[PDB]
Amino acid sequence: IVGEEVPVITTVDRKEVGIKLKVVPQINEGNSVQLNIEQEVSNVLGANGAVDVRFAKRQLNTSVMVQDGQMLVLGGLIDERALESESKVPLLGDIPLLGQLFRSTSSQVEKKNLMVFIKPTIIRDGVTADGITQRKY
Amino acid sequence: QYGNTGASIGNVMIGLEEAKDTTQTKAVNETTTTKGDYTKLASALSSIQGAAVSIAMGDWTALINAVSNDSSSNILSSPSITVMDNGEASFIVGEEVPVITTVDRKEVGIKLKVVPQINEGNSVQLNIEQEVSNVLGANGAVDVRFAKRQLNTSVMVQDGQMLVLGGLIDERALESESKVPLLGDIPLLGQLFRSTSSQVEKKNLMVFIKPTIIRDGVTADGITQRKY
Amino acid sequence: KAEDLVEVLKGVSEVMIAAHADTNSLVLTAPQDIMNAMLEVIGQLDIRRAQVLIEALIVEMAEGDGINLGVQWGSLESGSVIQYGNTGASIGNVMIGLEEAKDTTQTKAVNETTTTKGDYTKLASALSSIQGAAVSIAMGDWTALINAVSNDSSSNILSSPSITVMDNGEASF
Amino acid sequence: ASALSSIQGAAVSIAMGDWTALINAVSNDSSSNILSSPSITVMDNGEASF
Amino acid sequence: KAEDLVEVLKGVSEVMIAAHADTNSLVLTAPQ
Amino acid sequence: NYIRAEQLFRAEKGLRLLDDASVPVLPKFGDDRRHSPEIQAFIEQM
Amino acid sequence: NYIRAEQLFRAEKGLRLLDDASVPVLPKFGDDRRHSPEIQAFIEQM
Amino acid sequence: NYIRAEQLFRAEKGLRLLDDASVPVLPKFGDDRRHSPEIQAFIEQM
Numbered sequence: 001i002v003g004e005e006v007p008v009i010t011t012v013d014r015k016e017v018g019i020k021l022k023v024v025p026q027i028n029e030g031n032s033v034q035l036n037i038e039q040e041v042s043n044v045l046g047a048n049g050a051v052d053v054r055f056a057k058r059q060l061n062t063s064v065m066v067q068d069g070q071m072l073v074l075g076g077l078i079d080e081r082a083l084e085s086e087s088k089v090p091l092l093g094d095i096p097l098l099g100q101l102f103r104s105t106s107s108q109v110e111k112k113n114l115m116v117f118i119k120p121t122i123i124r125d126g127v128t129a130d131g132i133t134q135r136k137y
Numbered sequence: 138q139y140g141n142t143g144a145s146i147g148n149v150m151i152g153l154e155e156a157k158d159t160t161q162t163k164a165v166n167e168t169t170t171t172k173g174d175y176t177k178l179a180s181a182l183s184s185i186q187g188a189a190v191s192i193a194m195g196d197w198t199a200l201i202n203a204v205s206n207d208s209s210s211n212i213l214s215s216p217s218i219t220v221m222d223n224g225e226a227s228f229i230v231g232e233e234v235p236v237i238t239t240v241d242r243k244e245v246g247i248k249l250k251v252v253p254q255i256n257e258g259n260s261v262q263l264n265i266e267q268e269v270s271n272v273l274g275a276n277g278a279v280d281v282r283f284a285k286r287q288l289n290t291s292v293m294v295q296d297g298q299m300l301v302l303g304g305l306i307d308e309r310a311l312e313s314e315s316k317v318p319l320l321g322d323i324p325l326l327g328q329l330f331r332s333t334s335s336q337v338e339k340k341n342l343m344v345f346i347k348p349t350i351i352r353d354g355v356t357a358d359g360i361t362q363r364k365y
Numbered sequence: 366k367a368e369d370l371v372e373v374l375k376g377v378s379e380v381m382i383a384a385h386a387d388t389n390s391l392v393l394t395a396p397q398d399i400m401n402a403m404l405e406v407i408g409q410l411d412i413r414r415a416q417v418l419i420e421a422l423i424v425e426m427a428e429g430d431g432i433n434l435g436v437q438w439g440s441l442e443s444g445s446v447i448q449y450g451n452t453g454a455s456i457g458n459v460m461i462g463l464e465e466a467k468d469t470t471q472t473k474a475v476n477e478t479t480t481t482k483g484d485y486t487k488l489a490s491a492l493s494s495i496q497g498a499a500v501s502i503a504m505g506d507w508t509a510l511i512n513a514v515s516n517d518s519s520s521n522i523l524s525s526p527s528i529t530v531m532d533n534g535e536a537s538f
Numbered sequence: 539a540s541a542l543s544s545i546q547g548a549a550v551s552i553a554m555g556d557w558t559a560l561i562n563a564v565s566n567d568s569s570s571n572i573l574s575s576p577s578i579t580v581m582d583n584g585e586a587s588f
Numbered sequence: 589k590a591e592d593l594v595e596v597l598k599g600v601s602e603v604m605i606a607a608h609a610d611t612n613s614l615v616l617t618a619p620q
Numbered sequence: 621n622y623i624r625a626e627q628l629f630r631a632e633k634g635l636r637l638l639d640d641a642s643v644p645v646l647p648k649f650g651d652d653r654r655h656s657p658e659i660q661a662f663i664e665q666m
Numbered sequence: 667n668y669i670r671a672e673q674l675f676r677a678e679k680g681l682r683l684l685d686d687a688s689v690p691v692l693p694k695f696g697d698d699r700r701h702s703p704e705i706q707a708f709i710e711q712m
Numbered sequence: 713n714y715i716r717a718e719q720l721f722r723a724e725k726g727l728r729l730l731d732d733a734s735v736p737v738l739p740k741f742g743d744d745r746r747h748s749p750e751i752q753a754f755i756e757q758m
Contacts, residue, residue, distance in 0.1 A: 010239065032354070047235070050235055050272075051236075051237060051240050052235040054232050054233060054234040054235065054272075056232045057244065057246075058229065058246075059227075060226065060227065060228045060229070062218055062220050062224070063220065063226070064221060065221060066357075067357070071365065072357050072361050073219060074218075074219050075217065076364065077217075077230050077247065078214070078745075079212075079213070079214035079247075080212070082210075082722075082730075083209070083211075084209040084210075085206075085207070085208050086208070086728075087205065087207075088205050089188045089203055089204065090204070090205035093205070105728055107727045109727070115365070147492035151488075151489050159482050161479070161481060161482075162480045164478045165477060211719065211722060211735060211736050213736045223386065254389050288537065290528055290529060290531070290536035292531060300529070301529060303526070305526045306523075306525055306653075307522075308524070309521065309522050309644070310519075310521045310630075310635060310638075311520050313516075314516070314517040315497065316514070316517075317497070317498045317514065317515070318434075318513065330498070335636065335637040337643075341715060366610075370608075373615055377615060377617050406615055409613075410611055412611060422646075426623065426627065426630075430688070432684060438548075443553055444542060445551040445560075446545055447547070447548045448547070448549070455542075455543075457542035457543060461539050521627065521630060522644070533609065533610055533611070534610070569676070622701070626705065628708075628712070629705050659717065659721050662721050663717055666720070
């Protein structure tokens with residue numbers, strides 16, 4: 001977890017928000033790794049209006065089987081929105097040239113993408129751990 | 138006077154009179170002048186969405202009001218969760234919001250909880266619980282009210298083919314009118330004595346699901362490579 | 366599912382039947398004949414389930430109409446009214462409101478004379494409830510308040526929700 | 539205003555020689571007609587709420 | 589429904605009667 | 621067909637301020653869903 | 667038939683401000699539902 | 713294809729203030745994901 005403990009009414013309780021990854025691998029006796037994974041990305045949002053702060057939370061907790069050194073996509077979201085709105089007199093707002101004087105138009109386009117990938121790597125020899133630690137260092 | 142309209146002629150004329158500059162005279166020869174407040178007129182105009190036009194003719198003030206509200210919305214969100222066979226997965230993009238009960242943490246957002254099991258080839262069986270929520274203010278209510286559209290069912294889908302879980306198709310037409318009556322019947326001058334409020338709403342929801350079976354490592358690498 | 370099947374097969378066995386969940390496979394241990402029996406039961410309980418598409422259709426059609434018209438009378442000098450509650454507002458509150466709205470003058474001689482404008486709050490309270498035509502015809506201090514309206518309403522609603530379900534399975538929508 | 543608010547009808551004050559005779563008369567004619575029929579379709583021996 | 593039927597059939601049997609819900613099919617085991 | 625008749629009558633004297641194709645009307649019995657007249661017209665072009 | 671008689675009498679002296687076909691009246695015994703007179707007239711045209 | 717038809721019609725008369733390629737529209741049935749027209753154009757260059 002990289003994040004913060006924030007208190008929340010219930011009394012009160014300490015709940016952790018942030019980037020958190022809880023994983024329980026077991027290794028097929030060679031290559032592929034099986035992962036029981038619980039992955040969350042949160043953060044604290046003010047309560048409007050609400051009795052207590054509201055956490056923005058996007059998590060997926062699943063079980064996947066990934067090859068040794070290859071990446072695999074756990075999850076994702078692809079969201080698209082177009083909200084158009086208009087108001088007019090009506091009749092005068094229909095005229096092509098002068099219509100823009102009597103119209104109020106509000107247009108909006110939102111878009112969002114989330115992918116969550118995971119790459120395991122199996123460390124068996126000490127030279128492998130030293131090879132990874134050396135480059136991350 | 139009509140209630141269909143944004144604001145009624147009564148509050149508008151009263152507001153306009155309160156807005157005028159009033160003078161208070163005491164003779165014997167004192168004469169004071171004072172400007173009136175707009176708070177009543179401001180309270181009357183705050184609700185106008187549209188054209189509200191006061192045509193004053195011979196102390197008869199005709200208030201015309203007309204508006205056309207055209208709205209639209211288009212939304213696609215598709216959440217995909219990758220699962221081991223016979224294993225269950227939760228997926229949520231959303232927020233935990235507290236709710237009175239004391240209080241409790243309830244999750245709202247796009248959430249997909251699926252428990253597949255695979256026919257030994259092709260078709261996948263899905264126990265699926267799918268919700269799309271969001272937080273709405275409470276009017277009036279003791280606590281915030283969640284707008285929630287969910288369907289939780291059990292379907293059997295072919296390997297790589299899409300299947301429609303759910304949907305809603307909603308259509309509404311609400312017409313309303315008021316008139317004197319008799320004068321509002323005349324074809325040419327009737328529109329002077331009528332207040333018409335028409336509305337048409339429409340809504341569509343489809344919820345589809347496409348499984349894909351990943352067996353080889355080359356398949357998972359093929360999917361991950363394109364989503365990456 | 367193995368969990369459902371193991372429970373069912375307990376009786377047929379009566380041998381040990383154990384459900385392995387993660388593989389969704391059940392382990393049978395028995396002699397040869399009982400084995401060949403339970404494999405013929407499992408063979409026939411393993412069939413594919415058809416799935417229904419439930420499409421509801423909801424039709425709600427409302428319609429409304431009304432015509433409210435009547436004439437009221439009043440004289441506030443010696444208060445005498447022909448007054449009705451069917452109407453939006455009653456001649457009493459309307460005439461009282463109109464008098465409160467007039468500009469009042471307060472004179473103290475000896476020679477002070479003050480003038481003051483009256484509030485509309487009573488008249489505003491009387492007119493707020495009018496839906497329709499309320500027209501005051503003042504004739505010889507008798508003010509006849511005519512009021513008439515025709516409220517014509519309509520509503521038309523179709524919503525149909527369809528939920529797709531496995532047979533014998535339940536679905537909420 | 540408090541006295542007139544309750545008048546439903548004709549209340550007419552005829553003032554004659556400081557004696558004010560207040561006549562009041564009204565005829566309230568009301569009517570109501572209502573048909574609602576709800577039909578519920580049921581499996582035999584099964585129960586239905588509507 | 590199998591659940592209703594298994595309950596009813598217990599007495600007739602008195603053999604094991606087991607109701608499989610998802611297929612809505614009941615498994616009878618008895619002599620001929 | 622009783623309701624469908626009511627709705628067709630609603631479509632003959634329509635919304636005064638809006639187009640008469642905007643009033644919801646049941647499809648003819650057994651025909652499921654139909655595109656709007658304008659949308660249907662658009663579809664045939666493409 | 668007692669109530670139906672009452673309602674027919676309500677339809678003979680009708681709503682003064684509205685059309686007399688708007689007052690609800692039971693159908694003749696055993697005949698189930700009838701379209702309004704105007705709606706019925708419309709239906710025959712189509 | 714019913715919804716896809718609706719959305720294509722939304723794209724023919726588009727957002728008045730924004731580019732008509734910004735309105736979400738379902739891909740043709742079975743084709744999964746497509747890059748935006750401009751992004752797709754960019755990709756081919758690189």
